[PDB]
Amino acid sequence: ESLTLQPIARVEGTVNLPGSKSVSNRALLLAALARGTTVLTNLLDSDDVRHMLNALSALGVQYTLSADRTRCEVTGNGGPLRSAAALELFLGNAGTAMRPLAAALCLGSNDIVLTGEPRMKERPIGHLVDALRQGGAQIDCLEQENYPPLRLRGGFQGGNVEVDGSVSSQFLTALLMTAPLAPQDTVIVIKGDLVSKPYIDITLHLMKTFGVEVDNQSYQRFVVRGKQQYQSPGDYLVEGDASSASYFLAAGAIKGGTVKVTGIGRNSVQGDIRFADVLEKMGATVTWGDDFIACTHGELKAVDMDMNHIPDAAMTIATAALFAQGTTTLRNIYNWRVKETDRLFAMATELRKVGAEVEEGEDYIRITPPAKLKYAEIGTYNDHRMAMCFSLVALSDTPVTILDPKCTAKTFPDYFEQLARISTLA
Ligand SMILES: O=C(O)C1=C[C@@H](OP(=O)(O)O)[C@@H](O)[C@H](O)C1
């Protein structure tokens, strides 16, 4: 399957964003654990959220979904999830299901196997397993240490644990969400650097919404009290996805017009709102509201930036760079290599097909645009963001053909229709 995007002369309009994947999967898990019934509004319907919903169903969590799957009423368990069955749960390639559930299912005495798609068995989890085992959990890595599939037999108590923060923030996120329900207090020491720090902020905001605080000592040590229970907030509004927003804001920066996204704004908890600052640095004009961000085209110039704070939206800069004057350098993005695909390899390979010169560094990418873009069929590596990032090539005089366009469904099933709504073809 393939989708050819014809050249787009102008983009403009307003996009009502689908829900945030990151917020959706945290909110579902916390609602499942909490005391009380939580009503989630603007929940994302996408593969990663569906895998979480299916796992929660299999684990006995009671919830209802609206017809469009964006409103979800969760009856909280008031405690750790429990199953009497020797289940195997398939989690696709959803890190925000696999990592949080691997920790949560270490509470108690279940016997559950977590698995997923082939790529998920190549995505690291050992830093999380190590910390959970230090806290008393029984875990078997059925194929190889540091990777799924995992057999979880429970037993997490708490105590003094160390977690490496240098590969994924999700390991720390998973520990933080599980530790409050453990029988003992947990002190989490971060071994070295912490990547993707804004996602830790999301986790802490969500936990606070659900009635639980922790002592964050400069992102280097966390003190969590055990014996707690999450408390439903009642209604909870899931923010629009700021990573999904990046494509539309960039499209405005490149080929607007003014493109406005709604459902996020200056006070959002998602770190990817900071992507708009990069477009501003490149020369676009950005306007902020409490519930919108808008971007208007101006002449674009390349940037050289550390992107560790926005690793997902950073991919959008890599293709927006094709429209900027000069060489763009994106630094401190090593964990691109351990995500839906090796994104440093994939982005460099596909950028070259449209004519860019690319230096693929170990943990950075340097992109020098060609004078004129070339027509290419873009491989997407079963990676939603490869498809969405390369859609921007069509904001030029050259079409682009996106292979396997349905991979956008990991986070954004209707991406191409939403892009078309704001596009005027040349
Ligand atoms: O916690 C989260 O919601 C996420 C954390 C990030 O992963 P890393 O911490 O591995 O960079 C990000 O890439 C992912 O899409 C969502």
Ligand SMILES: O=C(O)C[NH2+]CP(=O)(O)O
């Ligand atoms: O969404 C992204 O760009 C990266 N997702 C990684 P996951 O959410 O599967 O851990």
